[PDB]
């Protein structure tokens, strides 16, 4: 194996929930998305981006109702054209070993559709509509979010801060189901 140096694999294993063997598997998957873009030899730390449009076609992501916003969350400019490091970071957050609070950190931002660092009724309607995959129509989503937003708003300001959100998802773990993706 001459794709990575031993120090690179040490760092990857220490900074993610993957073992070295997993890292080599992830490089193969990354490389297969775009062999003309991705070096087979990473020992000099090349900098390459694979477009979001290719990443969201992987079978592990393509059915996820938040696939674009998940991939964008690990990109510098929010466009989801990931480096290998970004790609590894994202599947480490998504893996079985990652703690709930790490998943929650990314989920809060991905569900904060109007980017004001709280979850309001309207953020929650857009989130639930995607989570329920056409099982619920527009007003059925309203019905649900009406009751959730009051129950979950512990502090009393009409919106959910990150603490409210973490307490919510501890009781209703299905809000994090889209952040459990094995690769």
């Amino acid at each position: 194996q001459t794709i990575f140096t031993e120090e690179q694999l040490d760092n990857y294993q220490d900074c993610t929930f993957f073992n070295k063997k997993d890292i080599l598997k992830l490089h193969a998957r990354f490389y297969e998305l775009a062999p003309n873009l991705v070096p087979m030899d990473y020992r000099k730390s090349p900098i390459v981006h694979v477009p979001m449009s290719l990443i969201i076609q992987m079978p592990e992501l393509r059915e996820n109702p938040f696939k674009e916003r998940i991939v964008e969350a690990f990109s510098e400019d929010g466009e989801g054209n990931l480096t290998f490091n970004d790609f590894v970071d994202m599947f480490s957050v998504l893996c079985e070993s990652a703690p709930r609070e790490l998943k929650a950190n990314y989920a809060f931002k991905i569900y904060d559709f109007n980017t004001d660092n709280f979850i309001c009724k309207e953020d929650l309607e857009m989130t639930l509509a995607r989570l329920t995959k056409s099982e619920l129509n527009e007003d059925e989503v309203v019905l649900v979010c009406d009751k959730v937003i009051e129950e979950a708003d512990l502090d009393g300001d009409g919106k959910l801060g990150f603490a409210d959100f973490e307490d919510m998802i501890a009781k209703a773990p299905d809000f994090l189901s889209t952040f459990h993706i094995r690769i």
Binding site: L128, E135, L136, N137, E140, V141, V144, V148, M168, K171
Partner: protein
């Protein structure tokens, strides 16, 4: 309908005064015990 299904479900989990009922599913208990515990708790709330 589908909204009412989701609603009473999510509302069950998030009620801060009925967390005994909400957390039987988190216990290493057999189904029969979980069901008898929920029946009893629901009487006294």
């Amino acid at each position: 309908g589908p909204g009412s299904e989701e609603l009473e479900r999510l509302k069950a989990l998030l009620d801060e005064n009925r967390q005994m009922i909400a957390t039987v599913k988190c216990k290493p208990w057999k189904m029969e015990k979980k069901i008898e515990v929920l029946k009893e708790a629901k009487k006294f709330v």
